[PDB]
Symmetry: D2
Subunit: 493 residues, 4 copies
C-alpha cells in the first residue's frame, strides 16, 4: 500500500558534474511545471554544449586507465549499484511522489510499478556487473586468443519524459555495470528525479565523474551530446524524428555507436477463440497505460469479425469507467498527460480521427479546467488508411479495426514501418506460435501486454529502434570486444 | 558381405588375445552372418593403451586444429554417406531394423549428428572471467581423455555416432565397445574412419560381451570417462564400477517408461497416429517408447477403437521387404521376455484388444499387441518392456494424471497432446521428463539435447550440453601488474 | 556463546531422534564448547522429507521468482555481514582458524560468494534450439531437487556457502550435513537463514557423523544430488553409495597434492612468499596445499635458504592473539597423522631444514616444518598431508618436471612461476591441473570455477560452471504449423 | 604448393539477380583492368540504382514468410554453404588465378592464404548455421518468455578491392548462415571473382534471390544500396570517409542497421626485451603484406631506444630483399598495387614523408615501365606529427618511430583516432598483458601480426569500424532478436 506522503521539497536543481553541483556556465535556468496544475515546481539549471563538454571532460578523466573506476573490481561496481538501489528504496517515497508531481504520473503506479521496476533493474544490472565474460577462442595455429568485453567509454544518454526514472535506470544500469562513464541528458519535462538520483549516486560512493547529468533541451544539450567527439556511444530514447537526428549527428562526428529506442504503432490482434474478458481488459490496459504515453501502446486493436461487436461494446464500457483526476489520489486512474505540446497533439489527432470517419464510441475531448487532461477515447470501424491508424498518437485514444482472415491480419499488422511490439490474443497452440513467428515486432506478447522485466530484451525491428536493452543483449551493446592473440610455443587441444 | 569382423585398434585389425570368436545372428532368419572376435580384458587394455598414446601431448590429435577435427568429422560423414546403402542393409540385417527405418532415418540421422558435431568442433569456447584483484583469469575447455563407450543394440549406428561425434569433435579418443548383437556396423564405420584420415589410435573398437569387455572398460584406471547407453541394471553396475576404479566420469543413458498424455481437445487423428508410432517405432525396442499412453475419458473409447485399428494395419514381415512396417526383435532373450510380459499382462487383467502373442516361427517376429484398461499397479505399465506392447491407460483430472506420469522412477521422456496453449505449457513444465513433446512424439534431433530426469538417465547429449560432458574446464589465473575494466 | 546446537529442519530446531549429542572441541585448548545433536538415519530422513515438501510444485519456493531468490540470497549475505564478528570468532574458536584469516578472508569470501550466487539467480537461462522440421524446440534449466551437501572441516563456512549459494540461487532445497568438528557455524547461518526470510524447509541442517549421517544422505532414495567436499576415500565411498541408491548425481571435491613449479626467471621474493603461503595457508589443512614445491637448480640452494627463513618468522600461537600467523589443527587424529608423516619423511631421508615436530602441549599446535631434497618416491611428497609440511623438490628440464607434476593421481591445482610469456602459457596448458596459477597461488574467487582433473575432484564450482551442476535441462518440442527462420 | 595456373576465360560479367544473369537496365558496361599490365580483362555490367532496386526486390521476395529460404532448415542452410565451399575448393585453381590476375595479388598467397581463408570461413559459417540459438528467459511473474534470433532481412553488402574473395566470404558467410538474403556490391577494381562465386552459389543450389550481386561504382550502386528503403542492414568495408557516408545514408533513410569496417594506422611496439629476428620479420610482414593494402597494416613501428638502430639496420636489409615482379611468376613477393589511383596516392604520400623529414632508408619511388609497382620503402626517425605517421598510406611504406618509456609508447599508440589493431613484441609476462590491456585496439597481437582466423572476432575501436565479424560476434550483428512472451497458467522454478 503506498504511503500517501503528499509533500516535496526540491533542493536539487543544478548540473551534476564530478560528483558536484554546478550552475550552467551560461547561468540560465528553465522552469519545470506540474502537469496537473501547470504551476512551476522549480527552476532547473539549463545546460548546453558548454556544460555538456564540461561533463564529458570529467567522464573521460574518470575513464582514464589507472583511475578508481577502471581499477575498480567488477564486483565492486555491482556493490555500488546495489547500494544505489538500496538508497533509492530508502527514498522510494520521495522519488515516487516526485515522479507523480512532476511527470503527471499516477502516484499508485509511480510507487508500485515504476519505482519497483527501477530497483529491480538496478539490482539486475548490479548482479550482471561481474558476470559479463569474454571467450577464449580456439584459433587455428599455435596461438592463444581470448576476448575482453571492455567498457565502450563515454556514453551520452538521452532519456524521455514518459518514464523518467525507469529510463534513467535502464540507461545507467548496463552502462555502469559494464564499466562505462555516462553523461545523461534528461528530458526538460522531467528533470528532477534524475537529479535526486544523481545525489543518491554521489551518496552511494561512485567515483567522481563516473555519472554526470546535464538538464537542458534536446536541440541544445542533446545535440551537443550526440555530436561530441569525445563521446564514444550515444543511447537515445524518444521520437523517431529525433532518432534519425541522433543517428545523423553520430555519423557526422567521430563515428560513435548509436542505440535508438523509438516509438511504435503496435497492433493487438484479438482472434475469435480469445478470452473476451481478459482480451478486453488487457487491450484497455495496453492502449491506456500511462495516459497512452507508452512506446509500446496498443494503438491498433485488430479484432476478428465474429467477436468484433461484443469487443467494442465491452471496450467502451471499460473506457467509460476510467476515473480521471489528480494523480495523488487513490481513486484516480488517469492523470494529466505531460505538458501542453503533447496535450494539443493528442487533441488534434482526435479531431483528425473524427474527420476521417472513425466512429467515436467514447468521448474525445478535455476534462477539467486545470491540467492537461484528455477523455479516454475509443474509435471503431477504423481502417489502415486513416491517420489515427498510422501515426503514433501517444495519447489515450484507442483504435479498433476489424479483420476476417488471419493472414490478412498478419499482413495488416506487419504493413507498417514500426516494429516495437505486438500482441496476440488466442487460446490455440497453433495460432499463437504462427502469429508470433510472422509478426515483425521486437516483442510479441501472447494473451498479455505491457509485460516487461529487467531480464528479457526490449527493442524494435524496422524503425522502432536499434539494438536491444534489458539483459545480456542490452549489456553486450555497452561493451567493445578486444581480441588479444599471443604467439605461443605450442598449442594442444 | 562383412569384410570387417575383428578388433579395430591403431587403425588396424587384430584378433582377440584368447582367439575366441562369438557369433552374430540376423533375427529375421537366425542364420549367423560371421564370427566377431571376442574382446576381453587384454584387448580392452591394449585398445586403451593405443588411445592413451593417441591422446598424448604433442601427438597429431592433441596439436590438431579444432577446425581440422571438424573437417575430419565431415570427411567421415561424407564417406558414411557414400556407403549409405551398404551400412543401411547391414544394420537392417544384423539388428532386424526395417530397411526404410535403417536408411531414411538411421543413416540420415547418423550423417546429421556427425555433421553437427563437426560444426561444433571449433566453436566450443572457454571464458575470460572478471576475477577480483589484479589478476587475469580465463578458463578453457579441454578434452577429458579416453572415453570408453558402451553402445547397446537398439540403435547401434545412431548411438555410436551420438557417442563418438561429440567425442571426436571435442578432441577425445574413443574406445567404443559395441553390442554383441550388432557389432558389425561399428567395425565398418571404423574402416571408414581409417579411410577418412583420422590419426591412428584416435578411434578403437573392441567388440565382445558386456560382462567381460564392458566391465573391463568401466573398471580400467586410464579410462577417463565411461559412457553407457542401455539397461538400468547394467547402468547401475557400470556406475558402481566407475566409482570404485579411477572415480571416472560416468554418463548413463537408460531406457524409460514414458507417458503420452492425450486430452480431449487434442486432434484425435494426429494423437492416435503419434501414440501408435511413439510405442511401436522400431518394434518397441526404443528407450523412449510411449509405454503409458494415457487418454481422456471423453474420447477414451473413441481412441482405442481407432488406435487398435491402426495396429491392425501394421504389416509384419521381413525387414528388406517393401511395404513392411515392422521387423523382428534383437534376439531370443528379448523374444522370451516380451512373451513373458504379454502373459503377465493377460494374467493381471489387462484387457487385450489386438494381437497379443508371437507369430512367424521363422524368426523372432511378434504381432503388434494393444492392451487396454491398464492400471498403475500392473507389471505391464511399470515394467519396461522394449516390445510392441501398448498400454492405453485412462485418467480424468489433470493434476492426478500429472502425478501419475510422475509416479515412477523413470523420467527419460514424456508426451502431451492438446490444442490449448495454456494446457500445453502447464503440462510440459509440470512433467518430470528430460524431453517433453507437444502434439508430437519421438522428434529427436542432433540440436536438441537428450538426457533423463530420474534413474532413466544421467547427463545430456545432442547440443552444447552434449559437448561440455566430454570436456574438462581448466582455469588459469595470471598475476598482472594492474587490472583495468 | 553458542545458542544454536540442534538440528535445523523446517526453520525450527529439533533434538535428535535418539537424543544423543556429540561434543565439539576448540583445538586451541580442547575445552568443549557445547554438545551438538547427533544426526542419524531418522534425522536425515525427516530433514529430507521437509526439503522434498519445500520443493513440491506450487510450493512458495518453486513458484518464487528467480530474482526474488537472488534477493533472498542478498538478504542472507547482508545478515551474515551484520553478524560478521560473531561468526568470525566462532569459526576461529571451533576450527582454530586464525582470527584474521577467519574475518578478513573467510567471512568476506562467504559474503562475496553469496552475493555472486544471488546475482546469478535470474540470469541463468535455457536456450531455444533451431531444430529440424516444423517444430519449435527450447530447453530450460530446472532445479534438480534435494541436494545433500557434506561439508568437511577445513573451510566450514566458505564450503557451506560454496554449496548452498549455488543451490539456493538455482532454486534447490539444501540438506547440509556439516563436519562433526565444526558444525556450529552452519547452525548459526541457518538461524540467519530463518531471519532472512527463506520459506520453511528450503534449508535444513543435520549435524552428526559422516559414517552415519553422511552415509544416510548419500544412500537416501529421494536425495537427487549428493555434493561431498573432503577426503578421497570418503569421496569414493560416497560415489559407490550414490550409484547404488537412486543413480543420484555425485559432485566430489577432494584434496590433492599440487605442484608449485618455480623457475630461475621467476621473481625470487614473490616466488618464495607465494610458495610459503600456498602450503602453510590455514596451517596446511587446505585441499590446494602446494605440496610439491619444485625449484630450478640455478636458484635451488638460494630458494630454500630464503624459504626456510620465512618459515622461521611464522609466529605460532593462539588464533585470537594479534600478531599470530598460524593456529592449531582440527583435532587429535590430524595431529597424530601429521606427526606420523613428519617421522616417515625423516625416516625416508627427507633432509629437514626447519621445525620438524610438535610444539605446545597446550593444544594441537605444530611447528612449521620445512623439508628439502624431497623426491617422487617418498611418502611425504605423494601422500596428502593436510599439515604445515613443505617438500622443496628439484628439477632440471621442463618436459621432465611437467611429467613429474603430472605423475600423480591427484590433479586439483598447480602453480607456475616465470617471467616469460611463452613459459607461462606452455606450462599452464601442459599441466593436468584444474586450476593452474601463474606468478601467484591460491587466488580463488567466486567467479573462477573450481574443480579437479583426476581423483582430486569431479565437477566444477564458482561460476556458470558451478550453476549447471545444480540443474537439469528439459527440452520441450512443440509441433507447429510452419516454421520460418 | 600452388598448382600451376592456366590461361583464363572470364565468362561471367553480368548482374546476378534471381539466380540469373542480367545486363544492366541502362546497358552500360565498365572495364576491369589487370594491374600488372593495365590491360582490360573484360567489360563488367555496370549496375546502378535501378539494378540495385530490381535486386533488392528479388531479395525481399526470397525473404518472404513461406518461401523456401525461410522454411529451409538451419542445417540445410549450413549444408548449402558447405556445398558452396566444396565447389570453391573444386575451382580453387581458377579462383586463385582470377584473384591474382584481377586483384594484382601474388598467386602464391592468392592460392594458399586467400583461397584457404575463404573455404575456412565458409565452412565455419556453415557450421554455425544451426547453432546460433536464442534463450528462454526467467521473466518475473507467471510468464513464459523466450527469444528468436531471426534473420534481419535484406542486407546490402559493400566489398572492398584489397581482399575481394575473402571479404565476399566474410560478408555472405554470417548473413546466409543466419538466414538473410543479401545484395552484394563488389568493388569496381575486383568484380570478377564475386561473379564466378555467384555462379557457384547458383550451382550449389541456393534458392533464387537469396544472394544477388550488382557490380558497379560506390557513388551509384553502393549509395543506392545504402539508401534503399527495402534494405534492412548495410555492411560496408572500405575507407573511413565512405564509412561516414554510409552511416549518413543509413541514418537519413530507413534507420537501417549499419556495420562499418574501416581502415587504421596500427602501431607495432617493439620493446627492448624482444626476439629481434622474429620482431623484425613480423614487422616487415605486417607492413608489407599485400603491398601494404591491408586494413591492419602496421603503419607505425614503435621501437625502444636500446634496440632502435639495430632494428632499422635489419628492417632495411629485410626490405631490400623483397623481390618485386609479376604476380603469376613464381618467386615474386610483391606485385602491382591495385590501380592507378592508389598507385599515385602511395607515391604522393612517399613524397610527403620525404619532404617532412623522415629519413628514407630504402626504396621510395616508382618501379617498372608496365604495372603499378612501388619499391618497398622504409622511413626512420618518424615523429607522430608527420603526415605519414597519421594517415593510412595503404602502400608498401614502413614507418619506424623511437620511444624510451613504455607509458610514452602507450599514449603515442593510443593518440590516434583509429583502433583497428595493434602489435606488441616482448618476452615478458607483465609487459604483454599490460600493453594489451592499455592499447585501444579491436585486435591486439602479441609477438605476432596479421593473425586472423574465422573464429576470433575482428573490428575496430574508435573510428576503424562499428561492431565485429568473424565468430559468434559476427553472428550477433546479423540477427534481430524477437522476445516472445506468453501468459501461462502457472510457472515453477
Amino acid at each position: 500500500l503506498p504511503v500517501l506522503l503528499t509533500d516535496l521539497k526540491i533542493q536539487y536543481t543544478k548540473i551534476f558534474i564530478n560528483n558536484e553541483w554546478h550552475d550552467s556556465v551560461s547561468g540560465k535556468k528553465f522552469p519545470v511545471f506540474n502537469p496537473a496544475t501547470e504551476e512551476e515546481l522549480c527552476q532547473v539549471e539549463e545546460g548546453d554544449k558548454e556544460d555538456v563538454d564540461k561533463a564529458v571532460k570529467a567522464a573521460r578523466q574518470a575513464f582514464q586507465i589507472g583511475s578508481p573506476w577502471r581499477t575498480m573490481d567488477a564486483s565492486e561496481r555491482g556493490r555500488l549499484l546495489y547500494k544505489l538501489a538500496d538508497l533509492i528504496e530508502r527514498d522510494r517515497l520521495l522519488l515516487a511522489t516526485m515522479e507523480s508531481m512532476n511527470g503527471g504520473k499516477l502516484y499508485s503506479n509511480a510507487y508500485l510499478n515504476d519505482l519497483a521496476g527501477c530497483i529491480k533493474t538496478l539490482r539486475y544490472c548490479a548482479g550482471w556487473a561481474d558476470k559479463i565474460q569474454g571467450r577464449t577462442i580456439p584459433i587455428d595455429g599455435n596461438f592463444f586468443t581470448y576476448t575482453r568485453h571492455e567498457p565502450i567509454g563515454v556514453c551520452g544518454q538521452i532519456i524521455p519524459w514518459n518514464f523518467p526514472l525507469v529510463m534513467l535506470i535502464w540507461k545507467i544500469g548496463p552502462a555502469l555495470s559494464c564499466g562505462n562513464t555516462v553523461v545523461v541528458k534528461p528530458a526538460e519535462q522531467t528533470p528532477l528525479t534524475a537529479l535526486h538520483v544523481a545525489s543518491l549516486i554521489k551518496e552511494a560512493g561512485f567515483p567522481p565523474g563516473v555519472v554526470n547529468i546535464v538538464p537542458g533541451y534536446g536541440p541544445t544539450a542533446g545535440a551537443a551530446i550526440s555530436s561530441h567527439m569525445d563521446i564514444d556511444k550515444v543511447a537515445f530514447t524518444g521520437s523517431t524524428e529525433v532518432g534519425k537526428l541522433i543517428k545523423e549527428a553520430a555519423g557526422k562526428s567521430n563515428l560513435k555507436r548509436v542505440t535508438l529506442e523509438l516509438g511504435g504503432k503496435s497492433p493487438c490482434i484479438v482472434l475469435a477463440d480469445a478470452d473476451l474478458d481478459n482480451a478486453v481488459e488487457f487491450a484497455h490496459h495496453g492502449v491506456f497505460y500511462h495516459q497512452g504515453q507508452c512506446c509500446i501502446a496498443a494503438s491498433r486493436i485488430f479484432v476478428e469479425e465474429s467477436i468484433y461487436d461484443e469487443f467494442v461494446r465491452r471496450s467502451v464500457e471499460r473506457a467509460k469507467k476510467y476515473i480521471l483526476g489528480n494523480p495523488l489520489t487513490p481513486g484516480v486512474t488517469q492523470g494529466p498527460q505531460i505538458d501542453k505540446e503533447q496535450y494539443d497533439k493528442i487533441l488534434d489527432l482526435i479531431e483528425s480521427g473524427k474527420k476521417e470517419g472513425a466512429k467515436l464510441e467514447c468521448g474525445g475531448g478535455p476534462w477539467g479546467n486545470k491540467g492537461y487532461f484528455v477523455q479516454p477515447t475509443v474509435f471503431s470501424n477504423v481502417t489502415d488508411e486513416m491517420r489515427i491508424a498510422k501515426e503514433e498518437i501517444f495519447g489515450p485514444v484507442q483504435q479498433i479495426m476489424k479483420f476476417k482472415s488471419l493472414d490478412d491480419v498478419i499482413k495488416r499488422a506487419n504493413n507498417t514501418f514500426y516494429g516495437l511490439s505486438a500482441g496476440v490474443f488466442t487460446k490455440d497452440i497453433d495460432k499463437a506460435i504462427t502469429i508470433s513467428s510472422a509478426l515483425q515486432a521486437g516483442t510479441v506478447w501472447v494473451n498479455c501486454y505491457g509485460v516487461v522485466s529487467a531480464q528479457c530484451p526490449f527493442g524494435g525491428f524496422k524503425m522502432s529502434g536499434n539494438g536491444r536493452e534489458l539483459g545480456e543483449y542490452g549489456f553486450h551493446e555497452y561493451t567493445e570486444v578486444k581480441t588479444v592473440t599471443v604467439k605461443i610455443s605450442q598449442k594442444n587441444s
